[PDB]
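Here's what a typical entry looks like (Replicase polyprotein 1ab (pp1ab) (ORF1AB)):
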Amino acid sequence: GHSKMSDVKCTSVVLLSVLQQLRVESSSKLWAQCVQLHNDILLAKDTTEAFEKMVSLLSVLLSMQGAVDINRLCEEMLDNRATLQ
């Protein structure tokens, strides 16, 4: 059974077309541990602050994934997205 967001065309595509598109390469159960939750995150709040935070998770998670400096020098796409993302 689907917990939320049951067939809405672009469940498990949107964040793959943005984050892993260049940041995180391909196939990491590590990264997927947040790429799962992004699918549910689309109905978090409102279409902005939902999807926004769906990008948030992975940007923090990229640290354990292999990053040391990808917060601050990347906040230009999160904080200068939305002062929120």
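The domain at 1-85 is CATH 1.10.8.370 (Helicase, Ruva Protein; domain 3).

More examples are in the samples folder.
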